[PDB]
Amino acid sequence: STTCCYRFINKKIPKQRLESYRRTTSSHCPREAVIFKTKLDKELCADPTQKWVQDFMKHL
Amino acid sequence: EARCACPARHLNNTNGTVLKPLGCHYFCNGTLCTAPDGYPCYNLTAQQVRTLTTYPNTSCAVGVCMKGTCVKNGTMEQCFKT
C-alpha cells in the first residue's frame, strides 16, 4: 500500500525475461505504476501507460 | 537509472494528498538511488524522524526533490508511517 515507484524501466523487457509477479502500486503514489519481477528476482517499476506494459499484464 | 527503477516505502498522511518519501534518497539493488527532480517529498528534522510513528504527531514539511535535497515549499501535512 505505501510502496511507490520513483522511476520506470523505459525500454520493453522481453516476456522471456520476466516472472509472473505483478503488483499495482497505490493510486495515491506520485506516479501510477505496476511492479514486475525479472527472472533474476529483481522488482522493476513499469509505466501502465506503455502498451509494452498493458500487453504483459493481459498475458498474465 | 534502470537500476533505480525499484519501489520503496512512502509515508502516508491524513490530508488526502499523494504519499511522499522521507527525503529524496532510496536504496535499490546495490545502488543508493536519488529521486527524480520534481518528485514530491517530506523534509523532517532529525528530532521529527526520531519520533516518527504509525500516527501523526508532528507537522511534516512537504518539499520537492532537487539534486537529492528535499526543498521545503511551505505546505505542512500530518504524515505517518505504515
Numbering used by the authors:
A (entry chain B): 8 to 67
B (entry chain A): 21 to 102
Paper text:
Evasins are chemokine-binding proteins from tick saliva, whose application as anti-inflammatory therapeutics will require manipulation of their chemokine target selectivity. Here we describe subclass A3 evasins, which are unique to the tick genus Amblyomma and distinguished from “classical” class A1 evasins by an additional disulfide bond near the chemokine recognition interface. The A3 evasin EVA-AAM1001 (EVA-A) bound to CC chemokines and inhibited their receptor activation. Structures of chemokine-bound EVA-A revealed a deep hydrophobic pocket, unique to A3 evasins, that interacts with the residue immediately following the CC motif of the chemokine.
